[PDB]
mmCIF file of C-alpha atoms and ligand atoms in Angstrom:
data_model
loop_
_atom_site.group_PDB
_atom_site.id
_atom_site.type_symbol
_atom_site.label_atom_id
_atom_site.label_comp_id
_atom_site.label_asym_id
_atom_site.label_seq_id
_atom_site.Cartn_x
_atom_site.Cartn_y
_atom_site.Cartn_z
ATOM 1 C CA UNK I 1 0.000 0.000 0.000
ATOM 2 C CA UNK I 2 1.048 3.511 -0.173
ATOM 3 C CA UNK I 3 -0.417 6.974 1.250
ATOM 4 C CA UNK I 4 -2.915 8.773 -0.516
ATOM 5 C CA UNK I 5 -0.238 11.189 -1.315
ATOM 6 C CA UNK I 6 1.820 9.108 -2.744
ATOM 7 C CA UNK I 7 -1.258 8.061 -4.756
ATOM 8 C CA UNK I 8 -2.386 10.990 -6.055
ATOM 9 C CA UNK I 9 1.576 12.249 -7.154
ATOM 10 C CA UNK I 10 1.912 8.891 -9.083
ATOM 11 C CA UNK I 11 -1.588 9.642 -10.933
ATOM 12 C CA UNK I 12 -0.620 13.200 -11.468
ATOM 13 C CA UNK I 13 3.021 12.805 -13.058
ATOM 14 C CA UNK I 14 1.128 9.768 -15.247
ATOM 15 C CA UNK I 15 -0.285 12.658 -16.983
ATOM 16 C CA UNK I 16 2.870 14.408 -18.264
ATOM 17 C CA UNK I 17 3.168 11.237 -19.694
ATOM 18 C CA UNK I 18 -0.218 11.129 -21.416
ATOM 19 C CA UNK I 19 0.665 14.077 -23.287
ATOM 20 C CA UNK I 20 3.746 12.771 -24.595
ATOM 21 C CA UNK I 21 1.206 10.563 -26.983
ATOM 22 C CA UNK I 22 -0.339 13.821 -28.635
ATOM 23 C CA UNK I 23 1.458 15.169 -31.468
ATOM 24 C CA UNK I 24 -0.110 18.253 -31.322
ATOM 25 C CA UNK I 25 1.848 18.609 -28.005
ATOM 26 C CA UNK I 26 5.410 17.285 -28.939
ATOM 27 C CA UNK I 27 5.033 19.611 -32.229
ATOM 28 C CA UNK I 28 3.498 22.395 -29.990
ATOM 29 C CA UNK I 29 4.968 26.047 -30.557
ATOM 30 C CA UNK I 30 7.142 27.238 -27.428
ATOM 31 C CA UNK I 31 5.439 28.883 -24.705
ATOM 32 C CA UNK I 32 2.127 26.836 -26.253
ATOM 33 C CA UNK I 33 -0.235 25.390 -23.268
ATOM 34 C CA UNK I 34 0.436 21.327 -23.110
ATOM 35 C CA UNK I 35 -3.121 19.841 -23.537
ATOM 36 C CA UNK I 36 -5.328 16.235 -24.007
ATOM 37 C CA UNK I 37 -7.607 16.457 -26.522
ATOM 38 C CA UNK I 38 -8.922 12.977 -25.072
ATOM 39 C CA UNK I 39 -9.523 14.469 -21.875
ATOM 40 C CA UNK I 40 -6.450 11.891 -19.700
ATOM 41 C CA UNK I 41 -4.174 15.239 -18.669
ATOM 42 C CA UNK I 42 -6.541 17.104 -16.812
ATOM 43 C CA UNK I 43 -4.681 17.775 -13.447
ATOM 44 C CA UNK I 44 -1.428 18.499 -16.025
ATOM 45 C CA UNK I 45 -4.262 21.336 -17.529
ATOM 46 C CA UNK I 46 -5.162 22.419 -14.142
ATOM 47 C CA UNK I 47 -1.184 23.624 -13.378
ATOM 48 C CA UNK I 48 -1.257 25.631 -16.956
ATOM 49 C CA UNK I 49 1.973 24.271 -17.370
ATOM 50 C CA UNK I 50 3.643 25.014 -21.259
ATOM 51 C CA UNK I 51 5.753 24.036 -23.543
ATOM 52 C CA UNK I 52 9.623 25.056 -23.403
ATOM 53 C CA UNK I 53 11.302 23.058 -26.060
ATOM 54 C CA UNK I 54 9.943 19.773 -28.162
ATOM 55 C CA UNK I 55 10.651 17.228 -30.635
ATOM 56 C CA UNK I 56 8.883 15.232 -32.587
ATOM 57 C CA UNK I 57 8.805 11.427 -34.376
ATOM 58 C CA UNK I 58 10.004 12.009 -37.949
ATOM 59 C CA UNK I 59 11.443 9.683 -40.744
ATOM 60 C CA UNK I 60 14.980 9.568 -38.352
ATOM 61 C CA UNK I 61 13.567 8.753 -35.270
ATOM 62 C CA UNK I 62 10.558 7.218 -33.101
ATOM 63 C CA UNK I 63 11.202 9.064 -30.221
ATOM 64 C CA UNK I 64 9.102 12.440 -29.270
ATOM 65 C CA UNK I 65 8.801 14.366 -26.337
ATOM 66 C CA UNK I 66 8.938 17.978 -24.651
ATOM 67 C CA UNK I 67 10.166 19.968 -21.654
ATOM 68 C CA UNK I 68 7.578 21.738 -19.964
ATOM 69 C CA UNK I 69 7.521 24.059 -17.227
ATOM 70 C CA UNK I 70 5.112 23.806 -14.341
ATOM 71 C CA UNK I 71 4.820 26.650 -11.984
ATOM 72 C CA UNK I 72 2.308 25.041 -9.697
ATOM 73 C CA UNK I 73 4.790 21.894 -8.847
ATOM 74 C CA UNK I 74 7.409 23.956 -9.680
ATOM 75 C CA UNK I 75 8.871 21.685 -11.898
ATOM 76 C CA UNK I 76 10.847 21.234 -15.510
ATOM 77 C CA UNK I 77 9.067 18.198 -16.742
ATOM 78 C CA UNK I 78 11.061 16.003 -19.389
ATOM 79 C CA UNK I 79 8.584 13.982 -20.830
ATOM 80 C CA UNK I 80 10.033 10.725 -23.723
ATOM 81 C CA UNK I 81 6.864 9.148 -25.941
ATOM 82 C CA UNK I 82 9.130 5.677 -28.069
ATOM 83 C CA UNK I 83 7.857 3.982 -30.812
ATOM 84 C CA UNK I 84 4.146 3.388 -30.413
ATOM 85 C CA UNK I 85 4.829 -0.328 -32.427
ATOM 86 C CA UNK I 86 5.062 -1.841 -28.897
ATOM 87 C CA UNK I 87 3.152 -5.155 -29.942
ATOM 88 C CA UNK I 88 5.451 -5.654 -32.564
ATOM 89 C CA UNK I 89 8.402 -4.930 -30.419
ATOM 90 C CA UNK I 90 7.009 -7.806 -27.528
ATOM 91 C CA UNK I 91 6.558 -10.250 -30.396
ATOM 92 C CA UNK I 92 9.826 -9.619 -32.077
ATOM 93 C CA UNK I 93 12.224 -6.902 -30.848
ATOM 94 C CA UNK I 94 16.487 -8.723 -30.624
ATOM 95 C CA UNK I 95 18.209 -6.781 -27.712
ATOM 96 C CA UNK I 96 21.563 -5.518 -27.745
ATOM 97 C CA UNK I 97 24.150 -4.732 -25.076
ATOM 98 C CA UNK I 98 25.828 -1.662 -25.758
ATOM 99 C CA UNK I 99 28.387 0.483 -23.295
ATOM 100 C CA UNK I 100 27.097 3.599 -22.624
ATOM 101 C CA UNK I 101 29.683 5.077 -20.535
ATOM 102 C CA UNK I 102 27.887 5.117 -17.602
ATOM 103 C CA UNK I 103 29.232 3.181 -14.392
ATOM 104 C CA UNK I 104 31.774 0.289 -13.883
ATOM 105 C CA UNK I 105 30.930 -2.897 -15.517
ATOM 106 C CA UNK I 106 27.059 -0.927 -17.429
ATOM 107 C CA UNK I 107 25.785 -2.208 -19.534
ATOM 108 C CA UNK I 108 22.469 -0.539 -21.577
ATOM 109 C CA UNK I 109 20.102 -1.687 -24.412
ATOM 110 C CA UNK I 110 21.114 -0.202 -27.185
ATOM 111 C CA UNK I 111 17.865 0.545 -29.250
ATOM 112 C CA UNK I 112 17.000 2.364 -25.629
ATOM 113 C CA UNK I 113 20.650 3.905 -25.362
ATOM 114 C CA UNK I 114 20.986 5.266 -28.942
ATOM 115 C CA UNK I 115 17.226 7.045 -28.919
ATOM 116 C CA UNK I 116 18.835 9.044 -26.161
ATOM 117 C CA UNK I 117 21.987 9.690 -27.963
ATOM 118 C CA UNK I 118 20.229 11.163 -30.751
ATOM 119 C CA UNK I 119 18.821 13.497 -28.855
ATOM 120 C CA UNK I 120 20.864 14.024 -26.041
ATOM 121 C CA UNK I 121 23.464 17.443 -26.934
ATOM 122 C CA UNK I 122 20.297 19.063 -27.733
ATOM 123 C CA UNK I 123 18.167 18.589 -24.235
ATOM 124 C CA UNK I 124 21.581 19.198 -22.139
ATOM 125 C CA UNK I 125 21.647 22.785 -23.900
ATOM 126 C CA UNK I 126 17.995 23.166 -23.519
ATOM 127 C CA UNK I 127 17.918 22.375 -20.016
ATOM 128 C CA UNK I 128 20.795 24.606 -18.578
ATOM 129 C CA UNK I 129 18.736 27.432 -20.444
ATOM 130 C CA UNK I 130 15.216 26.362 -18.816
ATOM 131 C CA UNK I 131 16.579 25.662 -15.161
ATOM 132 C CA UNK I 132 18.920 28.853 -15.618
ATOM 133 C CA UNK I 133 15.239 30.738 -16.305
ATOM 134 C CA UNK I 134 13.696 28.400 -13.309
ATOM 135 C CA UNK I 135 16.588 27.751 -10.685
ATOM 136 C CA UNK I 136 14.519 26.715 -7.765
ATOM 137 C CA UNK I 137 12.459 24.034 -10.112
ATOM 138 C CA UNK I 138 12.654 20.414 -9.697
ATOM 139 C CA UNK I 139 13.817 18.288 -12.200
ATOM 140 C CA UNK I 140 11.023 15.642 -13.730
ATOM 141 C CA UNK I 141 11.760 12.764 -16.215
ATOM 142 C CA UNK I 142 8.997 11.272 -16.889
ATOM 143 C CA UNK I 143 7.227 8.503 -19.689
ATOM 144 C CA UNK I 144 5.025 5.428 -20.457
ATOM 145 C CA UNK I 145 5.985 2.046 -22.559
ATOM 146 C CA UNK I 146 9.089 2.508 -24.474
ATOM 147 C CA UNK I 147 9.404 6.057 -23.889
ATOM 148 C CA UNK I 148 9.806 5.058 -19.866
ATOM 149 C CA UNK I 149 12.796 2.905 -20.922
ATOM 150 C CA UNK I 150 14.363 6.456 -22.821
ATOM 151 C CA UNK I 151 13.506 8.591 -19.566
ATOM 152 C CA UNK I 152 14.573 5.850 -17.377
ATOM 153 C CA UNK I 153 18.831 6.263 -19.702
ATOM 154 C CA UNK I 154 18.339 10.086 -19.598
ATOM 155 C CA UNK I 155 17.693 10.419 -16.063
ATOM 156 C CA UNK I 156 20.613 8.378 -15.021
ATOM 157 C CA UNK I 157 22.992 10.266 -17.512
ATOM 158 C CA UNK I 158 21.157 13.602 -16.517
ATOM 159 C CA UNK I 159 22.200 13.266 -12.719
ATOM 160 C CA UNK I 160 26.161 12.783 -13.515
ATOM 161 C CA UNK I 161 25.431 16.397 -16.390
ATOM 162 C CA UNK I 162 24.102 18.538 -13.381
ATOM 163 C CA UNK I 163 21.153 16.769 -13.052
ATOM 164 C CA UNK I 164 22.094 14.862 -9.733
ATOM 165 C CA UNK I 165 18.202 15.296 -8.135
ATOM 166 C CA UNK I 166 16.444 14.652 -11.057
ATOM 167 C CA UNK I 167 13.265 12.266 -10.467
ATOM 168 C CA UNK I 168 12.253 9.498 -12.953
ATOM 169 C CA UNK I 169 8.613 8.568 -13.108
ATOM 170 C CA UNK I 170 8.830 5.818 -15.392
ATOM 171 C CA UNK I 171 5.820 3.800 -15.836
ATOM 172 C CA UNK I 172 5.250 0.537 -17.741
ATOM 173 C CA UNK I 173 9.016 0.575 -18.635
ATOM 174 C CA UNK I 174 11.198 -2.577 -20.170
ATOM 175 C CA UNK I 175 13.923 -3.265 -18.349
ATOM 176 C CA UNK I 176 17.081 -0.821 -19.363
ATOM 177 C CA UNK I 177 20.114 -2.625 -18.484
ATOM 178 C CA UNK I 178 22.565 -5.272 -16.771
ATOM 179 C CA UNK I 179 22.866 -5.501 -13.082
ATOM 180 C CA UNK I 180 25.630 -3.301 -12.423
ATOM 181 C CA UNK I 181 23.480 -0.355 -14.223
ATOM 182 C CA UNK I 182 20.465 -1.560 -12.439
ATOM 183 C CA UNK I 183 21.914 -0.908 -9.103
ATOM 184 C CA UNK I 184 23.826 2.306 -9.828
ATOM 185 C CA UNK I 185 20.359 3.770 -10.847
ATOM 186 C CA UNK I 186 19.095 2.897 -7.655
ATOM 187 C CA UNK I 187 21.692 4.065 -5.992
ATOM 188 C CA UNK I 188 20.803 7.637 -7.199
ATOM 189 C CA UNK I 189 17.422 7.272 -5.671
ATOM 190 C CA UNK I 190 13.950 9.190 -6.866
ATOM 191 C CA UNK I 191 12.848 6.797 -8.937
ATOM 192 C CA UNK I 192 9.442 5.976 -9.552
ATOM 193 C CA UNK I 193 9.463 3.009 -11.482
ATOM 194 C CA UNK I 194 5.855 1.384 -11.929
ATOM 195 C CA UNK I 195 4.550 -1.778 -13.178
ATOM 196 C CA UNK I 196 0.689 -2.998 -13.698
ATOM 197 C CA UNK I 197 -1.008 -6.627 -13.100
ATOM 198 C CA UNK I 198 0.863 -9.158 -16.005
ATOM 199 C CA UNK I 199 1.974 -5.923 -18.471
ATOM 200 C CA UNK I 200 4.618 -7.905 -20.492
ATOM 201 C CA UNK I 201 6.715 -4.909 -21.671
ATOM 202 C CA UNK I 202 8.063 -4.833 -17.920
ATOM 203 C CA UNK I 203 9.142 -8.204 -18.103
ATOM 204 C CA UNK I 204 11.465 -7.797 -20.718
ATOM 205 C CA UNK I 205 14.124 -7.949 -21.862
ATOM 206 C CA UNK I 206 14.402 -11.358 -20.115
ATOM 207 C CA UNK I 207 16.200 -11.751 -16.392
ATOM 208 C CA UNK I 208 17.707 -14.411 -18.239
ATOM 209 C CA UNK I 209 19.072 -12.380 -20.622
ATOM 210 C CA UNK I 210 21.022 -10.628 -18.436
ATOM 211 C CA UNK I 211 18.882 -7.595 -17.332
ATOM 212 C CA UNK I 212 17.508 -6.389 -14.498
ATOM 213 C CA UNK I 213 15.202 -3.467 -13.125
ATOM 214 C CA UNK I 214 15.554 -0.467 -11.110
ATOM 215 C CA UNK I 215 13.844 -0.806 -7.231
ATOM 216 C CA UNK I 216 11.700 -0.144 -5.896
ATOM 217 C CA UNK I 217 8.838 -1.599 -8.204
ATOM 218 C CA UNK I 218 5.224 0.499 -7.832
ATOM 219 C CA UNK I 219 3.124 -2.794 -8.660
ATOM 220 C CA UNK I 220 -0.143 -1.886 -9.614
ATOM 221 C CA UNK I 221 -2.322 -4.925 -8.809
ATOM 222 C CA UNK I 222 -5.475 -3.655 -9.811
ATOM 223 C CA UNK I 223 -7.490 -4.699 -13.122
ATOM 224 C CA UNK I 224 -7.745 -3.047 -16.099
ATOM 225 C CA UNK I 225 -9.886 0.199 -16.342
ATOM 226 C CA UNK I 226 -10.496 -0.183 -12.307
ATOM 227 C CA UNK I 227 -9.347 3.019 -10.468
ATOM 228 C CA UNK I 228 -6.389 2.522 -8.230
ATOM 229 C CA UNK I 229 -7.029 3.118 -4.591
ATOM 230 C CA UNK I 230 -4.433 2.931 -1.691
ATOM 231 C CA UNK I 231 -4.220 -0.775 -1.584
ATOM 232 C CA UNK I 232 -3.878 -1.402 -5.135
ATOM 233 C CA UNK I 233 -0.231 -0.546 -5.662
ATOM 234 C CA UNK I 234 2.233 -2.869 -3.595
ATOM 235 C CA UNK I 235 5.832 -1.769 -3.105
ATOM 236 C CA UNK I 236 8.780 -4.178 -3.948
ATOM 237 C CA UNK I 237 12.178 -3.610 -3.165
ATOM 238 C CA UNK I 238 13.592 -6.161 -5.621
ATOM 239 C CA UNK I 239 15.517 -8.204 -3.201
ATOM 240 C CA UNK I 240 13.825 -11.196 -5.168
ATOM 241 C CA UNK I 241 14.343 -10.809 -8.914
ATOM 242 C CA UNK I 242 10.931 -12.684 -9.650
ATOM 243 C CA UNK I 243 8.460 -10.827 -6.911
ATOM 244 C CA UNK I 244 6.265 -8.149 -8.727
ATOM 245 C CA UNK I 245 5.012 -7.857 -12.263
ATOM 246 C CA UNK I 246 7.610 -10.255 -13.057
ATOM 247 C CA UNK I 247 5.943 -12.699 -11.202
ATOM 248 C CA UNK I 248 2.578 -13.274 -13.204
ATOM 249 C CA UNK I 249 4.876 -15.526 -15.444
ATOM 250 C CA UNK I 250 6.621 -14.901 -19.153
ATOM 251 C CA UNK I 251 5.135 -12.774 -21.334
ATOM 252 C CA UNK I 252 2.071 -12.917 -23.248
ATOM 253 C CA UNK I 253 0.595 -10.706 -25.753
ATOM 254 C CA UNK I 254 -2.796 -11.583 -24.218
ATOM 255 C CA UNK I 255 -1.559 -9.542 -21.470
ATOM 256 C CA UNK I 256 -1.358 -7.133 -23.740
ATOM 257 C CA UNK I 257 -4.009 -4.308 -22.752
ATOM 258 C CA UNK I 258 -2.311 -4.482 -19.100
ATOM 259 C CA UNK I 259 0.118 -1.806 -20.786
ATOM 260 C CA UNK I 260 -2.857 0.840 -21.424
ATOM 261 C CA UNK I 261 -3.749 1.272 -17.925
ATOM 262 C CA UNK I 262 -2.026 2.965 -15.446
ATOM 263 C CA UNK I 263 -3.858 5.373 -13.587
ATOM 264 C CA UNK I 264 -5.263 6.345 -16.658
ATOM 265 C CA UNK I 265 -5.033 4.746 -20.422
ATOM 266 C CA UNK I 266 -2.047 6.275 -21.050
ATOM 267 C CA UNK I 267 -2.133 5.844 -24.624
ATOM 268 C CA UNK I 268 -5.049 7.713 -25.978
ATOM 269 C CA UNK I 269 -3.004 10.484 -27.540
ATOM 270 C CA UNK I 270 -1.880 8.544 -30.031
HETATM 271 CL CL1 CL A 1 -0.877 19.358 -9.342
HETATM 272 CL CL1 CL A 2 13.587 14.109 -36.529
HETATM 273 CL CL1 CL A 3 2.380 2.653 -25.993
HETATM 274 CL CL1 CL A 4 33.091 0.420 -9.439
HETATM 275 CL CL1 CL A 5 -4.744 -6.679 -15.715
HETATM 276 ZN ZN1 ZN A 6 -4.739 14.670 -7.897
HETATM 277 ZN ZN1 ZN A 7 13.508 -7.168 0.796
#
């Protein structure tokens, strides 16, 4: 269980998330009020927060996003939408080990590592301009699906390039990386790293493939389309590699819709 708090920060950042999915968003002029046209940001309305800096999906990449500013949470939300083929990357995605520099003996998916690469040079210089013009602000990385695993690299990378209290609210994520990258991402703390019933994009790439997640795990154990109360989200501290989400067994593409729902269906933007 957590505290309703808790509960209602993990439904809130969910949101920033949400409208990472709309491409009128991620291809939103600067300054540019984010917004839902499907009605799943509302709270993220509520702050007026707007749009500092975005990038969309194009014929180069698959990865879009924004930073945002929110003077209500006083926060400089990074927000990461990935490819939205996330069926076809369950059924038939090959993971790669690649060195990204990182920490002693890290390792990171490379698909996952080299979306942030792309992009990286570009949201360091945007970011020293946006806290510079915010310097009390928060730092929030935030995504859903895919785009979790891309906020879940940039975070980590973010805290050793001034970053070093940046949170990560990364919900629904794929594991990111080998053990040794697993536990120096822990180490850093604020991570919010959530899972939901038998999702199968959380259980992979495989424990048996080498690769492991960041703890805690918020385990959403509620059904699909239910609305998560207090008692619906257990907390795991990964001691046990196979307690949690990974638990419900390998991964099935009947599990499929399990993805959609967190707090909200996440993926209505798209
Ligand atoms: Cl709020
Ligand atoms: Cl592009
Ligand atoms: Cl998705
Ligand atoms: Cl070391
Ligand atoms: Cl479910
Ligand atoms: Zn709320
Ligand atoms: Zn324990």
């Amino acid at each position: 269980d957590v505290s309703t708090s808790e509960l209602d920060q993990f439904e809130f950042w969910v949101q920033y998330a949400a409208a990472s999915y709309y491409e009128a968003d991620y291809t939103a002029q600067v300054g540019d009020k984010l917004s839902c046209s499907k009605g799943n940001c509302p709270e993220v309305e509520a702050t007026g927060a707007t749009v500092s800096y975005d990038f969309s999906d194009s014929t180069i990449t698959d990865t879009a996003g924004y930073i945002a500013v929110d003077h209500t949470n006083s926060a400089v939300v990074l927000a990461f939408r990935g490819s939205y083929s996330v069926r076809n990357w369950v059924a038939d995605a090959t993971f790669v080990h690649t060195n990204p520099g990182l920490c002693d003996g890290c390792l990171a998916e490379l698909g996952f590592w080299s979306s942030w690469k792309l992009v990286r040079d570009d949201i360091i210089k945007e970011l020293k301009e946006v806290v510079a013009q915010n310097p009390n602000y928060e730092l929030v990385v935030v995504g859903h699906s895919l785009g979790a695993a891309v906020a879940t690299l940039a975070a980590t990378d973010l805290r050793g390039k001034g970053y070093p209290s940046a949170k990560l609210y990364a919900y629904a994520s794929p594991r990111v990386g080998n053990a040794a990258l697993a536990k120096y991402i822990t180490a850093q703390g604020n991570n919010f790293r959530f899972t939901h019933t038998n999702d199968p994009v959380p259980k992979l790439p495989l424990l048996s493939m080498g690769y492991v997640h960041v703890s805690p795990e918020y385990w959403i154990t509620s059904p699909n389309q239910a609305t998560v109360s207090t008692s619906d989200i257990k907390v795991i501290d990964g001691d046990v590699s196979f307690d949690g989400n990974t638990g419900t067994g390998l991964p099935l593409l009947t599990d499929f819709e399990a993805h959609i729902w967190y707090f909200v269906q996440v993926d209505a933007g798209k």
